[PDB]
Design a protein around this ligand. Structure first.
Ligand SMILES: Nc1ncnc2c1ncn2[C@@H]1O[C@H](COP(=O)(O)OP(=O)(O)O)[C@@H](O)[C@H]1O
Length: 258
DNA sequence: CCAGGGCTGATCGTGCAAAAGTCGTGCCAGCCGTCT
């Protein structure tokens, strides 16, 4: 509900439309898909969805679907009421349940193994997750929001990703425009990144931007995303020096031998 | 003078499992009873 303090810096007149779209999704409990490319700041949008929802007071755990162990999947997702030691007074909590009352964020959906895919598909459709041991089903209420950069229709075509959980979890998608599509906010991000760098390196003052530098970073196909642009500025501002002259040289990729 | 943070000690806990041991039941050898 309360707008958390985050950097979205939106002026592209397309990012504003995406922001309105996600704001419309803020109250609803329906599953949400975030579609983007490398970088693109999808995590900020996901945090925006969770943190402007009715259940925002709830927790906001975010699991890395690539990071879950294969064998330990069941206990990791559910937990075991039995303690680690004899006569234990408590148990470890699984990924699920630890999310109840709030949203669960999923990332790298495409690279999730088939074991994760099939185990996660069963739990969402019905809930009633049961920890290993005992016969007591616990009912859960968790919002799911996920972000990915690969092409899950192609993943379905190859069959390396099950289409059923996709269909269940594809109520609505939000499209994120690439930085090259935005092509208007580059000045403001460049400047904000440079100002942050000024304090990080403890440089005294920002020198300024030359027209040649503006032309070169503007006239770029930008396969890299906002973070690639961020790193670019980071490299050039440091290589420039102590701001006695305006910033003049931009190195697009630090790989050319020279 | 009252409230927040740190820190130290007080408190909780009689089961798991691996290996030795024991169980029942069979196989075979050696001595004894008896008829031919
Ligand atoms: N609007 C924005 N404001 C501030 N930073 C941004 C913005 N968009 C992108 N970024 C930067 O780009 C990065 C994208 O990270 P992330 O969303 O994790 O990429 P991916 O979704 O591919 O994993 C973030 O670390 C963030 O610092």
């Amino acid at each position: 509900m309360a707008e958390y303090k985050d950097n979205l810096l939106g002026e592209a007149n397309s990012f504003l439309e995406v922001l309105e779209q996600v704001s419309h999704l803020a109250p609803l409990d329906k599953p949400v898909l975030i579609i983007g490319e490398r970088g693109t700041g999808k995590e900020l949008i996901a945090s925006r969805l969770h943190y402007l929802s009715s259940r925002w007071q709830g927790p906001f755990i975010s699991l890395n679907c690539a990071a879950l162990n294969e064998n330990l999947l069941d206990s990791e997702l559910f937990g075991h009421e039995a303690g680690a030691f004899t006569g234990a007074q408590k148990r470890h909590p699984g990924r699920f349940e630890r999310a109840d009352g709030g949203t669960l964020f999923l990332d790298e959906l495409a690279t999730a193994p088939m074991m994760v895919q099939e185990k996660l598909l069963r739990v969402i459709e019905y809930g009633e997750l049961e920890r290993v041991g005992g016969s007591q089903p616990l009912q859960v209420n968790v919002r799911l929001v996920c972000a990915t950069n690969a092409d899950l229709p192609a993943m379905v075509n190859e069959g390396t990703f099950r289409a059923d959980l996709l269909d269940r979890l594809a109520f609505d998608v939000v499209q994120l425009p690439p930085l090259r599509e935005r092509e208007s906010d580059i000045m403001l991000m460049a400047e904000y990144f440079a100002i942050q760098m000024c304090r990080e390196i403890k440089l005294p003052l920002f020198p300024g931007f030359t027209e040649r530098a503006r032309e070169t970073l503007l006239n770029y196909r930008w396969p890299g995303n906002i973070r690639e642009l961020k790193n670019v500025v980071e490299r050039s501002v440091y290589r420039h020096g102590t701001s006695d002259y305006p910033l003049d040289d931009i190195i697009i990729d630090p790989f050319k031998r020279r």
